[PDB]
Amino acid sequence: RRFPGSIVVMGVSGSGKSSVGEAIAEACGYPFIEGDALHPPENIRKMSEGIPLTDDDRWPWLAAIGERLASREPVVVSCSALKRSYRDKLRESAPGGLAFVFLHGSESVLAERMHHRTGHFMPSSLLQTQLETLEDPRGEVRTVAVDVAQPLAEIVREALAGLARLAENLYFQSHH
Amino acid sequence: RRFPGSIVVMGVSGSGKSSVGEAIAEACGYPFIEGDALHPPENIRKMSEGIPLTDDDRWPWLAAIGERLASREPVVVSCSALKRSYRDKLRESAPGGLAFVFLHGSESVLAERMHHRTGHFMPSSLLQTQLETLEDPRGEVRTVAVDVAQPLAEIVREALAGLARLAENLYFQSH
């Protein structure tokens, strides 16, 4: 099928949210929005310096993410959405209608993939902090988890299959 | 004495361009533009990952910086402007009317300043690559250099004193 609602592709920095998010969006005929582009100036400066963001820094960004997810027509947005707080809020912007695709891997695989993809290693401090901040979403509602230690085309096919199952469940409750 | 034109506060990441840029803007009654806010989505993702930007990545951003500098009314914009290529292009947006405030310091002073300010150390690799990319602007036209190993209020006063000198020189070539 095809999930009848907005999709957030989450996961730590460097996990591939934008690549996966764009492929998902194209496959579903939905527009893709890169979450990074909605950070206020202050946040970008910190990221530019390689300094971690605080909860306070994120909230106005998450608010802007939430507003995009609230549109009528479905949208696919890349957003790390590391904490449970962040995801629960985002869900309120589209109650019972928001799906999350969780891209995940160990520090080693994540680091290797970035180097294998850009020729550069992400600073170890950045990646570890992301991982310590990450609160595993598995178990939470309408969440599809996909490991990244596989071809990109496989990661996308699997994310879409997971979304198709979520769609199946909706078409079921909607028709008792 | 205000410099009659736009001002770019340059220098590597963490040098304090935004703090100084905002102070200068207030002092001159000019609006301040945070250069970082004009990076296209692709650039922000790389910075978020702690990955350096390439020359190709920067030009779209530099074009947007140039467009803001081109307005008729003077603006103060924070922009690292590390290479001479970048600065020369930005000058073209405001022919003979652009001033640069170069904030600089050694790697250790820069690193400690950031820790002292945010409780965090900038990743060493990021700071080293910035400094490696930095092409010293001293000697280029209408450029005021200021070392950061001193109080912020002193950095600002000195930047403005330097801009006042540039203004004085224009007021001379003009009359």
Mutate to test the interface with B, among A10, A49, A61 (most CBs of B within 10 A): A49
Determine whether the interchain pair B118/A14 forms a contact, defined as Cβ–Cβ distance below 8 Å. Answer: no
Closest residue in B to A117 (Cα–Cα) = B51
Provide the 10 A C-beta neighbour count for residue A154. Answer: 12
- Resolution in angstroms, to 1 decimal, for this deposition? 2.2
**How many helices and strands in chain B, by DSSP H and E?**
7, 5
DSSP H or E run through B8: strand B6-10
Closest alpha carbon to A8 in A147, A141, A107: A141
Kindly write down the DSSP assignment for every residue of B135-156, as one continuous string. ---TTSTTEEEEESSS-HHHHH
CB atoms within 10 A of CB A43: 21
Residues on chain B touching A48 (C-beta within 8 angstroms):
13, 36, 47
Q: Got the DSSP string for A16-61?
A: -HHHHHHHHHHHHT--EEEGGGG--HHHHHHHHHTPPP-HHHHHHH
CB contact at 8 A, A31 and A68: no
- Nearest to residue A10, comparing CAs of A50, A51, A65, A52? A65
Q: How far is CA B153 from CA A3, A119, B14, B158, in A?
A: 56, 41, 17, 9
Contact A99, A8 (CB under 8 A): yes
- What pairs with residue A9 in β-bridges? A78, A101
At residue A10, the 3 state secondary structure works out as: strand
Go through B128-156 and write b for each residue having 16 or more CB atoms within 10 A of its CB, e for each that does not.
ebbbeebeebeeeebbbbbebeeeeeebb
Report whether A111 contacts A121 (CB < 8 A).
yes
Residue with the two structure tokens 């590597």? B12
- A contacts of B10 (beta carbons < 8 Å): none
> Which residues of chain B neighbour A40 with C-beta distances below 8 Å?
37
Among chain B, residues having any CB pair with chain A shorter than 8 Å are 13-14, 18, 34, 36-37, 39-41, 44-52, 114, 118, 120-123, 125-126
Report the 10 Å Cβ neighbour count for B57.
17
C-alpha separations of A17 from A165, B110, B140 in Å: 20, 32, 42
Inter-residue contact A24 to A159 (CB < 8 Å): yes
CB–CB contact A51 B125 (8 Å): no
Shortest CA gap B173–chain A (Å): 38
DSSP conformation letters of B106-144 = -HHHHHHHHHHHHSSPPPHHHHHHHHHH----TTSTTEE
Q: Which domains does chain A have, with CATH numbers?
A: 1-176 (3.40.50.300)
State the method: X-ray
